[PDB]
Design a protein around this ligand. Sequence first.
Ligand code: HEM
Ligand code: HEM
Ligand SMILES: [Fe+2]
Ligand SMILES: [Fe+2]
Ligand SMILES: [Fe+2]
Ligand SMILES: [Fe+2]
Ligand SMILES: [Fe+2]
Ligand SMILES: [Fe+2]
Ligand SMILES: [Fe+2]
Ligand SMILES: [Fe+3]
Ligand SMILES: [Fe+3]
Ligand SMILES: [Fe+3]
Ligand SMILES: [Fe+3]
Ligand SMILES: [Fe+3]
Ligand SMILES: [Fe+3]
Lengths: 157, 158, 157, 157, 158, 158, 158
Amino acid sequence: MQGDPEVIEFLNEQLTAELTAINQYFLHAKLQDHKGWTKLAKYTRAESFDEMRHAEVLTDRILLLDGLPNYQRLFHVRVGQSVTEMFQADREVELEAIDRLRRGIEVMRAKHDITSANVFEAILADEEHHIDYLETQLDLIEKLGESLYLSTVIEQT
Amino acid sequence: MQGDPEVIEFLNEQLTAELTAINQYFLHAKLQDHKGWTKLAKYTRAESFDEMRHAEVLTDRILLLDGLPNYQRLFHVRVGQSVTEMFQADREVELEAIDRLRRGIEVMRAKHDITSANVFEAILADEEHHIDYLETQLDLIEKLGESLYLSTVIEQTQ
Amino acid sequence: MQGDPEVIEFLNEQLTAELTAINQYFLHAKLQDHKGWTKLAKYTRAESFDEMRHAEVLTDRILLLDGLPNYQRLFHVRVGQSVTEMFQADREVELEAIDRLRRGIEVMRAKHDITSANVFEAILADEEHHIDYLETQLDLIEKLGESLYLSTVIEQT
Amino acid sequence: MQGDPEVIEFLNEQLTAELTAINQYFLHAKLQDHKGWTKLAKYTRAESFDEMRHAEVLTDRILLLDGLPNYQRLFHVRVGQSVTEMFQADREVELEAIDRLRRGIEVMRAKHDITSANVFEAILADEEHHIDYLETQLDLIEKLGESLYLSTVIEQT
Amino acid sequence: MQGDPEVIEFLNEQLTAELTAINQYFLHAKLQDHKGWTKLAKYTRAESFDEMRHAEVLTDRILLLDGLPNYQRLFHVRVGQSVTEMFQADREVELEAIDRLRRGIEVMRAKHDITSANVFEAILADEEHHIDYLETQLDLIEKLGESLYLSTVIEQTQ
Amino acid sequence: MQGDPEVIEFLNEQLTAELTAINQYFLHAKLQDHKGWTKLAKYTRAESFDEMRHAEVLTDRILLLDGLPNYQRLFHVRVGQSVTEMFQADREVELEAIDRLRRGIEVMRAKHDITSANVFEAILADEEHHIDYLETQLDLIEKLGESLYLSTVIEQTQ
Amino acid sequence: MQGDPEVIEFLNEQLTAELTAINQYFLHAKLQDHKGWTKLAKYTRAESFDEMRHAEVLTDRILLLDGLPNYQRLFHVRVGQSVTEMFQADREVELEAIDRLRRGIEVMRAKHDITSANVFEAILADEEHHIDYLETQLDLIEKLGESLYLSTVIEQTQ
Ligand code: HEM
Ligand code: HEM
Ligand SMILES: [Fe+2]
Ligand SMILES: [Fe+2]
Ligand SMILES: [Fe+2]
Ligand SMILES: [Fe+2]
Ligand SMILES: [Fe+2]
Ligand SMILES: [Fe+2]
Ligand SMILES: [Fe+2]
Ligand SMILES: [Fe+3]
Ligand SMILES: [Fe+3]
Ligand SMILES: [Fe+3]
Ligand SMILES: [Fe+3]
Ligand SMILES: [Fe+3]
Ligand SMILES: [Fe+3]
């Protein structure tokens, strides 16, 4: 079994995106932990682990088709200073991933490769869930304010 | 046994009110959950389940008297956007229900049907409890303010 | 993310159908229980609970796309006196739902919205299972007769 | 505390009715057991025990008001040969009891004695439940028939 | 919700009666304990706790109707030296309470307030039970006598 | 063993104060609960129970000296509307009790009655602890403010 | 509440004494442990912990009266080389503490402050117990001799 070059190109691009997201989320979680924001740090760490799992699944699929996974690329990593900036960077990453996923699913399903399409479908569902969470948090920050919002995620122990 | 038409009319009206309340409470709970207000959503969901139980009891009573329960009617459903509006809509629903319940209890007890009157009495007690809760929450929101009040019901986990 | 108005129209129509089915199934279960047919009533209750689960999933999907769920309109509720009539009404409801589901799945998948299509696919599978059950019960009633069939679902307790 | 003679008259009448019902139900249960109708007898015994409890409650209420309970008077006991006849006799007893209960509740509540009215209210609810069960069983027998209905309550043991 | 002033007046009067009964029963139980009549003292203490429960229910009902509970007014407390005198004082208190309860129930039920009527109904049942107990004990004392009756409620130690 | 009239007078005055404090604390706890302030209500209820225990101990001591406990008196009961007013009323009650306790301890210990002095000593220690708590809460309210302070004692239910 | 400056002066002096005793006892325990006398070291360490408990109680009492505890001042710490010298230093410390405690108790009880007097009473009882222990050990050393006495407190103990 040998997949089409275009399918492998799509999968490798998604893999590069996954690696970039992993790095960005881990760095954001560490930065949030250093400031005393504990629950945000826990949530961000869990998100980074989920991205790790996605990268593993993509690597397995690429290996099954007799391709060469790319572990050398990296997209630009965005780092914020306040909470709003971090949320906005995450939203940008998610939007890019969703657009790429939809286009790839269409192209893959047009050439009789169904398993890759299902993989992208699952990843797309997860990305939509995460983006919904991010938008909800941004709305909450907009309504309450920065200080009153941060007062709810600080713990002393 | 065949009940009077007026008793069955009262019971069917209360059933329609129960169904409307169930729908409104579930929609409000889902809307609150979508915004990140977790404990409010839990409380509203519990209230919706209680209304479901009330509807079931009313249906049983109507069936025992050899009547036809009405599952096709619906009153107007009110949807709010902020917390104050939701509380106000719930208060309106409760006030209407309480007035109807008192009138129905009087009429039923005037014609020698005691079990239906007892059913309405229990429902009336529950409605009064819920309306008291709603008024307390409105007072708390008035005293504190929307932002500080909402800061106490938000939690991000898993 | 804002979905197309046509997708939301399809989802809201399916939601209205779900609410109507919930009402009809619960009323039928109560009516069957009042007559002494306990085993039928248990199954009808289970079906009504499944219909609620479907309605909840649909509501969540509609909320995620920034739409307004419709909890105000209902279709026509069918009530039967015999058991054959109840089965026939349920069959009619199921056939309508299946037709709507297939058309909606095609339309949704034509516009690059995959998650909604998957939701409709799951609902369609469930509806097909239920319709198969209903047809089997109608065949059994036709073969045995109403009295001999009803003699098998009554208890004293 | 001494109650009005009319309240005590009502309570004693209701006690005589309870004793008659106890005797009739126990005799019917024994007769049904002799014929091999195993599942009906258990239900009939349970009904007889419930009547015993009702009689005890009435006796306690009468004693608290400084009255003399009547354990010497009985009404006419009806015995049936078929199952339809037994159900019909039970229905007659229940209808009489319900009428008496409603009239007594009205009279008692007109003279400021609330506890006796509540006692009759509870008894009335129980009587309504039992009469509903009896009517359902009569309908089932009418639909199925004597032999097919009786075939569902026999057991080898 | 705002109840009629007459209903609140009835409820406050019943509350005052409850507080008076609590005080009297506790004092009687302590006095009985000081003399060595342990088994009587246990029963009297339990009765005092029941009177507390009644008072709490009444206070909650009054608060739900947007009224002001009265915790400042008391009736006259009766204290006896013998056991017959204690039983007689308790009987007097119970008779007064029962009369008030019946009149209040009628008045409340005449104005479409059912929950308060149910509360008074429950309290009335409890009071009737207690008065029956008191009368039975008085009859036993009359039949046996003071010394032979008291010989059955004294215990050395534990 | 017959105590001096002055010692019994002191003990009866302290008993009257205890009964008044019990009533006031219970009413305040119920009022706080009706408004949605849960933890405050729990704390106030515990304080009322402690006052009940103090009253029981005083009654036992009075009975052991062959005296007549007074269960008919009552001092003026203070009721507030906001939290600050309730705390201030409690502070006033505590200050009065402490002054009376010190004077009584001196007088009792001057006449060779040591057990009563020890009883008052224990009660005095408890009163000082409670007054310290009240002053701390008043300082916290002064610093934070009423709304931000009340935002920390409100909960939903289940 | 604002205590008299003299009471606070007494309490602060006792606190300084407690801190000095804590330091001396811990140093003695460590020195004894370094030489191989394990059983003596355990007892001395326990005594140091008791001194901490006393210091904490004193600090809490001083804070309740709206005073400023003194954690900066120390007395002279005595260090011995042999065991007899350590026991003698401890005896000196205890005697000073007992004298101060008695005078302070009298002064405090003369001004109507009973809780502080009770605190000093408890501390005085503990000090008397410890001084009795020290004198018994000195007598044992005098009778047996240093070598035969030390032979009973050494363990190879891994
Ligand atoms: C999304 C909407 C709904 C949710 C989440 C929901 C949830 C539930 C659940 C979990 C139960 C108990 C499950 C069981 O024990 O089998 C229940 C029971 C019940 N529901 Fe619903 N349901 C919904 C819709 C409705 C509607 C629309 C009605 C009436 C129009 C209704 C009426 C009832 C009744 C009467 C019961 C009592 C069932 C019994 O006792 O047999 N429900 N509901
Ligand atoms: C002067 C009036 C009162 C006196 C002398 C009094 C006395 C007492 C005493 C000494 C106890 C002992 C409880 C124990 O040993 O744990 C007690 C129990 C109790 N009383 Fe009172 N009380 C009075 C008023 C009230 C009121 C007005 C209420 C309610 C609003 C009340 C509620 C209670 C409760 C709840 C308990 C038991 C607490 C528990 O079991 O958790 N009391 N009473
Ligand atoms: Fe991912
Ligand atoms: Fe309801
Ligand atoms: Fe469905
Ligand atoms: Fe009966
Ligand atoms: Fe009472
Ligand atoms: Fe006290
Ligand atoms: Fe010390
Ligand atoms: Fe993601
Ligand atoms: Fe309600
Ligand atoms: Fe279905
Ligand atoms: Fe019956
Ligand atoms: Fe009572
Ligand atoms: Fe106090």
